[PDB]
Design a protein around this ligand. Sequence first.
Ligand SMILES: O=C(NCc1cc(Cl)cc(Cl)c1)c1cccc(Cn2ccnc2)c1
Length: 305
Amino acid sequence: PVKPNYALKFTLAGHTKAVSSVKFSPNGEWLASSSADKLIKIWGAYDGKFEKTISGHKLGISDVAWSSDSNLLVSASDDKTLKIWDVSSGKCLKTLKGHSNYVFCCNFNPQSNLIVSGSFDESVRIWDVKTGKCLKTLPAHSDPVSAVHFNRDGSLIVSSSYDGLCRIWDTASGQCLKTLIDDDNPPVSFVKFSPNGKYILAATLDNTLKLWDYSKGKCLKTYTGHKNEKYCIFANFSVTGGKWIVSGSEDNLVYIWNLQTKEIVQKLQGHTDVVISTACHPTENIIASAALENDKTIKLWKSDC
Ligand SMILES: O=C(NCc1cc(Cl)cc(Cl)c1)c1cccc(Cn2ccnc2)c1
């Protein structure tokens, strides 16, 4: 497989405002979406069929994340709070209060007993799932936080911000172990670990994605061609078939790169506004995508490799 062949299979309509994020469940059954319309929705991952709507937040939602057993959800909202949800019942189990401004990004750790979050108050907080109380507050940045992610065994946390920085945090201690500085520092709009945990993928608002060896502090790969200067766009590692890099773009397209050669191998067309979020299915060659206010739709593409 030197090139994939993703083609549209389903289009998922429902949200009455801009979509903010989409995520696949670990067991591979479901797709979850958050939106500016305060709502969370669940969809069939193979058939694109609507399942249910989960409500509660008093303002818009920017992000959502699955637990490892596909039974819980955490969400980050403009009401300065996070909420933990039981997917089956639709009940709100906990309401994480702490941040003093918009909560923008969230994630479970591999063990799924902890939750990390980033906020416009320029901080990162570590929460306990069962008690719902905050364990650590990290003075991470001097600008809004754009992304937070656990590594493979949950021992590390990576974060990014509009201040231009990427930082590695020890989960147990809460100490700052590393700070990534390039030749220049444009705002970092996204970051996350690699599946093997050796690398991080970082995006900056100068239309550029990069692969970093964080321990040795050097850039290994660079990916360009798309447009990204205003929005924090998600990016993924595609591992089920060919080894690609997936990301949205401000020109209403989904870009797919060959991880090694850094070549654009496929560009997906269909949306009518900025593509803000993408995700990759855990066992099948399926990609999900979502778009902003003028579009409001979610799309499911499938490939043979
Ligand atoms: O780009 C956005 N706002 C502009 C912005 C962001 C920050 Cl952090 C700061 C400023 Cl000043 C302006 C945006 C809004 C809603 C949903 C997502 C998708 N997403 C990405 C990560 N989590 C959700 C991105």
